[PDB]
Amino acid sequence: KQSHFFAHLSRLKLINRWPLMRNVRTENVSEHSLQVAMVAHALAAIKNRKFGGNVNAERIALLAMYHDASAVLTGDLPTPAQEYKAIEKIAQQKLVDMVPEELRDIFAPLIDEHAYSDEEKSLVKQADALCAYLKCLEELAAGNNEFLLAKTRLEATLEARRSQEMDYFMEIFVPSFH
Amino acid sequence: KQSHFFAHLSRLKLINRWPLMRNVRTENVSEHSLQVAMVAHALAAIKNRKFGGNVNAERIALLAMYHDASAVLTGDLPTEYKAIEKIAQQKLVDMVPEELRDIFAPLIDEHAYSDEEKSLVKQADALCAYLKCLEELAAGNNEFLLAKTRLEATLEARRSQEMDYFMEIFVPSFH
Ligand SMILES: Cc1cn([C@H]2C[C@H](O)[C@@H](COP(=O)(O)O)O2)c(=O)[nH]c1=O
Ligand SMILES: Cc1cn([C@H]2C[C@H](O)[C@@H](COP(=O)(O)O)O2)c(=O)[nH]c1=O
Ligand SMILES: [Co+2]
Ligand SMILES: [Co+2]
Numbered sequence A: 001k002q003s004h005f006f007a008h009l010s011r012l013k014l015i016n017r018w019p020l021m022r023n024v025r026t027e028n029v030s031e032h033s034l035q036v037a038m039v040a041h042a043l044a045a046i047k048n049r050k051f052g053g054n055v056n057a058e059r060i061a062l063l064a065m066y067h068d069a070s071a072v073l074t075g076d077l078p079t080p081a082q083e084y085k086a087i088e089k090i091a092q093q094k095l096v097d098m099v100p101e102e103l104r105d106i107f108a109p110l111i112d113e114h115a116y117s118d119e120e121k122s123l124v125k126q127a128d129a130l131c132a133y134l135k136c137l138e139e140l141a142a143g144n145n146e147f148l149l150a151k152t153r154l155e156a157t158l159e160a161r162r163s164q165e166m167d168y169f170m171e172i173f174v175p176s177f178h
Numbered sequence B: 001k002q003s004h005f006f007a008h009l010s011r012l013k014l015i016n017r018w019p020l021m022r023n024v025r026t027e028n029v030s031e032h033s034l035q036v037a038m039v040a041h042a043l044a045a046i047k048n049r050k051f052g053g054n055v056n057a058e059r060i061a062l063l064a065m066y067h068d069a070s071a072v073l074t075g076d077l078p079t080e081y082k083a084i085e086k087i088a089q090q091k092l093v094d095m096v097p098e099e100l101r102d103i104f105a106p107l108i109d110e111h112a113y114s115d116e117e118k119s120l121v122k123q124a125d126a127l128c129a130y131l132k133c134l135e136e137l138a139a140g141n142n143e144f145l146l147a148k149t150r151l152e153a154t155l156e157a158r159r160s161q162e163m164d165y166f167m168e169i170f171v172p173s174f175h
Helices: A005-014 A029-050 A057-066 A082-098 A101-111 A118-141 A145-160 A164-172 B005-014 B029-050 B057-065 B081-095 B098-108 B115-138 B142-157 B161-169
Strands: none
Touching: A005 A029, A005 A082, A005 B029, A029 A057, A029 A118, A029 A164, A029 B005, A029 B029, A029 B057, A029 B098, A057 A101, A057 A118, A057 B029, A057 B057, A082 A101, A101 B029, A118 A145, A118 A164, B005 B029, B005 B081, B029 B057, B029 B115, B029 B161, B057 B098, B057 B115, B081 B098, B115 B142, B115 B161
């Protein structure tokens, strides 16, 4: 019995994001997921280091790697309801069911977003919103105003998900994006 | 002090691999790195679960995420590229805000990998190149034919119980 699990994960790089706008450069889910992982890990390490945190940052990188993994079954759906969130959970679950049985308990808590602690959830949602904001900033620096709307809207999401670790992040790493 | 560190990591997606052949689909360092991290983690976890391992699979993910990070300063270097590499790493480390350097420096420079971790990340890197050959060969691109044959030799030299498990269980779905 062979497993199709990694065969499906290999198609992440095929799934394109932000379909409703002209993109100066088309982002795929695989590039996004690597950036969210790097960002969510950093947010966690900053939290731990500077803000009283006690979160497993390495664990948070791996959850970030897999946070949109079900896109390979569903496709990307641009965030602009309860039903969809439900479909995402079924897709996450079908992916889990592909993992060989003796391995399943390693991967379920990585793919199934029910398994995220409250803190792990906050950090990966903070990373995801930041990454989306960074995408907008790259596009606007490339002279593309189709992302102007989205930037402004993400500025609200980020204040909703505001933390000290995000504030540090925004102050220190974001201005080089402009 | 703002830092250009993440500005530069975001450029991983720009650096293309396998530049000397025709590719049906061009692969970038960012795609590669996520994939090596997924495979390395899997290998680590397999070893632990089936083969008496005691390795930190999450640490191994994180290492693999950053294993080619300096490629943003140098470009893809097709296999003293080791000298160029060491300089780019250090440049990337100098960019990290000082107060956080101890966190990232080991990730970038790769000086503190255990032996096991080196083995697993390097098995993952070879496997990922080998998967890329199968994908290209599946799309009728024979330019990856030699490479596939060579990597079967890289994989044999780096052979492990966990690699064997991975090849038997997950890789047929790619051919
Ligand atoms: C955050 C965000 C994402 N998106 C798009 C990008 C992707 O194509 C898709 C899913 O994004 P996600 O990774 O943030 O959930 O939605 C928007 O269109 N507007 C937004 O504000
Ligand atoms: C492993 C491997 C990589 N490469 C290429 C792909 C990349 O463009 C570059 C570095 O790859 P690496 O991630 O395996 O160090 O070398 C080969 O041409 N042949 C090989 O066997
Ligand atoms: Co996402
Ligand atoms: Co590599």
